[PDB]
């Protein structure tokens, strides 16, 4: 019902500040939780950050920042003080409130996924 | 004698209305002061949403569910939907729910109220997943008891929000009904505003402003003393603690010798009132509902409401003493509402039996001025110029409310002909009596004396009143043609219906 | 149509008091407006007093306080009481009734119905 496309990322030196923009086509209902998942080579998907469409915020850090336009159905995640081990594939995931209103960090709960970047 | 009657009526209406306006302004100031101290990103009370429906149109049910899902409140334990179905037709409403929410539609065999174990764990097994329940048709009270039990299953739930199957909420209609519960420990119930969106017909247009006046003015003054008489159907928040205590003497309600199958929100508020608790009304919570368009259905609704009013008025008078000094105003409001109908009836009878043009013209002009002031206040408050249409509501009150109130007492104090004349014969008799009185007054006073100053005054006043109502109706017609009377929600809903 | 019958009147010395009254027979006396006119020996009819359907009293000049007009719907009659009689007051009094009219009320032609009238004479 909703299609998520994430853009941004690339080969960058340790000193830099990336910006990944995830745009969703469909309806978000101001209650779905949007999250970013990290997949390093040879590893599995791990939680990075998440936030409700209305408001909130839960990182991990104090260095990552979450932004939501809330008007064009798109949102952004920025990075600061990149590390050599931070390079991985980033996935934009959405969790609807149809099943339950509980918040979880398990990637299994999320049902909508997009193609990875970087 | 006529001068005394007119002056006393005018004062007895306008002074009380002004006092209600002042008290509502004070209540609004208090609510704004409470809100000003709310920290950003506040989520402390855990709320459970309860919706009860019965054969609702799929479009409006879907819109209500989506608007509920659009709420910005971040602390919602679970959504509970209860349907009076289990035949076949309401399976389609369950399908709409499955389209809007998860595929969890239980089919209990019996109602919890009649069950030997009134516990939610009998029919429910998960406390974290949204649940829809189809129950045998027993009414709205029986379905609300099941929702209360399911909400009381979770020990972390602190409050419940009740929504009708048609009410469409705003983005912050839940956050505003649950904050006053955490402001004062003695507050155990919060009332939300209700608005009418289908303001296309003239009757619906008048009913919308009647609702606005009866919510902003009538209930704000009551909430200043924290003694709201009725929380309301479309929107309302309750504490789980008071519900766990008052839900037992609420399903076995008896009045004289029979069960009650109407109200279900006024008695629930009254039960909170009789325990000394405080109930407030927040004007910042908005819920959109529809109003009947046909006159006969509106009359039926009004008489059904008055049926429960004529009992809960004595029920609240019997418990107003527990609150203390707060409650003298409650009793005064009750006596005002009791005596106002009698005063209107007596004044109409006195000015109709004595066919005097002067008294009739003076009464018409005084009523017009009073309703103009009342509509002006609503126009100032709502920032909307359409509130002036409320000046026409008097006609409705003289043709759709008074016969309904009379019928509500003449049938409760005690084939198709009895089923149809039990609710409309009194209305027809009232209309015939009004027409006969008008014809008698016109025929008895049949002369034209322009040399008399008072006859000129009477004729000019009646002509000016007719011109005023005519231009008001012309403005309404022009607005309807231009679609200026359509609310933005109605404008969006019409386009959505067309797109479907 | 209304029928007017006069009553009262007689010989009264100067400075006395006299009450006359006209009774109307008709379908509805309440809506009618009554008036009392005088015909002097000069034979020029003129307005003297009037009462409207809304109990409004109209008096001519020099008879503002001397003359008092009253109306009674129970016996559907209108009575004029005159005090401090003067030599010029000896004349014939007529009672007239109207149902439809305009701003003009002092003219004899503006009243549809009329009465027989009675002669009142004053002796000095
Ligand atoms: C209605 C609008 C106002 C009336 C306009 C029509 C009457 C009119 O124009 O009057 C003209 C005429 C009276 O003047 P006229 O007789 O020509 O004067 C010469 C005297 N011999 O009129 C006539 O001769 C005819 C008069 C016919 C009746 C006039 C209207 C009566 C209306 C009923 C009473 C209204 C007041 C009470 C309303 C109660 C409402 C609850
Ligand atoms: O007195 C009352 O309890 C109701 O009266 C009116 O109700 P109305 O809109 O005029 O007519 P309905 O549509 O029949 O009732 C409103 C809702 O009550 C529920 N209901 C009604 C009837 C019923 O048999 N069972 C039932 O659950 C439904 O959810 C319905 O949406 C008010 O609009 C309601 O806010 C109020 O709850
Ligand atoms: C065949 C035709 C000529 C019949 C004429 C109808 C009249 C008998 C009706 C039409 C409008 C009515 C009036 C409409 C409004 C009012 C105000 C009403 O007072 C209220 O509305 C008080 C309650 C409130 O404030 O809402 C008192 C009766 C009165 C004068 C009504 C008296 C009866 C009237 C003149
Ligand atoms: C808009 C609103 O709340 N209207 C209420 C209705 O919900 C309630 O059922 C009834 C009492 O029977 O009283 C009405 O005033
Ligand atoms: Mn409905
Ligand atoms: Mn409704």
Structure report:
The complex is a heterotrimer of chains A (118), B (500) and C (124). With 118 residues, chain A is mostly beta strands. In chain A, 0% of the residues lie in helices and 37% in strands. In chain A, strands 1-2-6-5 form a 4-stranded antiparallel β-sheet, with no helix packed on it. A 4-stranded antiparallel β-sheet of chain A has the order 4-3-7-8, with no helix packed on it. In chain A, strand 3 (33-39) and strand 4 form a beta hairpin. Chain A is globular. With 500 residues, chain B is an alpha/beta fold. Chain B folds into 2 domains: 2-6 and 331-499, no CATH class; 17-313, Alpha-Beta Complex (Spore Coat Polysaccharide Biosynthesis Protein SpsA, Chain A), CATH 3.90.550. Chain B contains 16 helices and 10 strands. Chain B has helices at residues 2-36, 58-69, 89-100, 140-153, 202-216, 218-224, 240-246, 248-251, 266-273, 295-317, 328-353, 357-382, 393-410, 416-444, 453-482, 488-499, and strands spanning 47-53, 76-85, 105-106, 131-136, 159-164, 168-169, 187-196, 235-239, 278-289, 448-449. Chain B starts with a helix and ends with a helix. Chain C has a single domain (3-122), classed as Immunoglobulin-like (Sandwich), CATH 2.60.40.10. Helix content of chain C is 0%, strand content 51%. Chain C starts with a strand and ends with a strand. Chain C has strands at residues 3-8, 11-13, 17-25, 33-39, 46-51, 57-59, 67-72, 77-83, 91-98, 100-101, 118-123. Chain C is globular, with a radius of gyration of 14 Å. In chain C, strand 5 and strand 6 form a beta hairpin. Chain A binds chain B through residues 29-31, 52, 54-56, 97-102, and chain B through 41, 66, 69-72, 74, 76-79, 100-102, 128-130, 171. Strand 10 (448-449) of chain B pairs parallel with strand 10 of chain C. One manganese (II) ion is lined by residues 56, 166 of chain B.
């Amino acid at each position: 019902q909703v299609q998520l496309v994430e853009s941004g990322g690339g080969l960058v030196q340790a000193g830099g500040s990336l910006r990944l923009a995830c745009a969703a086509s469909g309806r978000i209902f101001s209650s779905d939780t949007l999250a970013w998942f990290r997949r390093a080579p040879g590893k599995e998907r791990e939680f990075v950050a998440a936030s409700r469409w209305s408001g909130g915020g839960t990182d991990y850090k104090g260095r990552f920042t979450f932004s939501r336009d809330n008007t064009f159905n798109t949102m952004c995640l920025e990075m600061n003080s990149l590390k050599p081990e931070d390079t991985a594939v980033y996935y934009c995931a959405l969790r609807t409130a149809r099943d339950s209103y509980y918040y979880t960090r398990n990637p299994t709960g999320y049902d909508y996924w997009g193609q990875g970047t970087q | 004698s006529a001068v005394w009657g007119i002056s006393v009526y005018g004062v007895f209406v306008l002074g009380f209305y002004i006092a209600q306006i002042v008290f509502s302004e004070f209540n609004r100031m208090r609510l704004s002061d409470w809100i000003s101290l709310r920290p950003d990103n506040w989520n402390a009370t855990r709320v459970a949403v309860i919706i009860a429906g019965y054969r609702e149109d799929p479009f409006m049910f879907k819109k209500c569910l989506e608007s509920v899902r659009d709420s910005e409140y971040g602390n919602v334990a679970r959504l509970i939907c209860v349907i009076d179905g289990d035949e076949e037709e309401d399976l389609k409403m369950a399908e709409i729910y499955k389209q809007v929410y998860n595929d969890n539609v239980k089919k209990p065999g019996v109602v919890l109220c009649e069950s030997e174990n009134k516990n939610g764990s009998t029919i429910d097994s998960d406390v974290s997943k949204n649940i829809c329940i189809l129950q045998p048709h027993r009414g709205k009270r029986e379905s609300l008891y099941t929702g209360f039990q399911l909400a009381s299953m979770d020990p972390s739930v602190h409050a419940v929000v009740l929504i009708d199957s048609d009410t469409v909420l705003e983005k912050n209609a839940i956050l505003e009904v649950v904050y006053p519960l955490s402001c004062d420990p003695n507050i155990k119930a919060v009332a939300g505003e209700c608005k009418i969106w289908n303001t296309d017909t003239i009757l619906s247009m008048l009913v919308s402003w009647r609702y606005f006046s009866a919510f902003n003015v009538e209930r704000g003054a009551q909430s200043l003393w924290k003694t709201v008489q009725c929380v309301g159907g479309p929107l309302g928040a309750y504490t789980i603690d008071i519900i766990n205590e008052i839900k037992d003497p609420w399903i076995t309600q008896t009045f004289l010798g029979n069960k009650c199958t109407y109200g279900d929100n006024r008695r629930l508020t009254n039960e909170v009132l009789m325990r000394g608790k405080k109930i407030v009304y927040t004007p910042f919570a908005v819920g959109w509902s529809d109003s009947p368009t046909n006159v006969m259905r509106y009359i039926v609704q009004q008489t059904r409401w008055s049926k429960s009013w004529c009992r809960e008025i004595w029920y609240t008078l019997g418990s107003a003493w527990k609150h203390g000094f707060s409650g003298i105003y409650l009793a005064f409001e009750c006596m005002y509402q009791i005596m106002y109908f009698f005063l209107v009836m007596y004044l109409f009878s006195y000015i109709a039996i004595k066919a005097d043009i002067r008294a009739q013209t003076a009464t018409v002009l005084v009523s017009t001025l009073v309703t103009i002031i009342k509509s002006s206040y609503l126009a100032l408050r709502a920032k909307n110029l359409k509130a002036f249409y409320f000046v026409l509501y008097t006609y409705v009150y003289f043709f759709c409310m008074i016969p309904a109130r009379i019928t509500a007492m003449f049938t409760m104090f005690d084939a198709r002909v009895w089923l149809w004349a039990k609710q409309f014969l009194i209305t027809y008799m009232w209309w015939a009596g009004v027409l006969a009185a008008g014809v008698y007054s016109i025929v008895d006073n049949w002369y034209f004396d322009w040399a008399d100053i008072q006859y000129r005054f009477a004729l000019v006043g009646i002509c000016s009143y007719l011109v005023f109502v005519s231009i008001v109706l012309v403005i309404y017609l022009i607005g309807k043609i231009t679609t200026w009377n359509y609310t933005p929600l109605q404008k969006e809903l019409i386009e959505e219906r067309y797109l479907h | 149509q209304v029928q007017l019958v006069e009553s009262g009147g007689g010989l009264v010395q100067a400075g006395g008091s006299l009450k006359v009254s006209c009774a109307a027979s008709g379908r509805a006396f309440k809506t009618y407006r009554m008036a009392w006119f005088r015909q002097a020996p000069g034979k020029e009819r003129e307005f003297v007093s009037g009462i409207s359907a809304l109990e409004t009293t109209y008096y001519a000049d020099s008879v503002k306080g001397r003359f008092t007009i009253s109306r009674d719907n129970t016996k559907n009659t209108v009575s004029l009481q005159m005090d401090s009689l003067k030599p010029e007051d000896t004349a014939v009094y007529y009672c007239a009734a109207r149902r439809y009219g305009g701003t003009d009320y002092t003219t004899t032609g503006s009243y549809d119905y009329w009465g027989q009238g009675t002669q009142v004479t004053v002796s000095s």
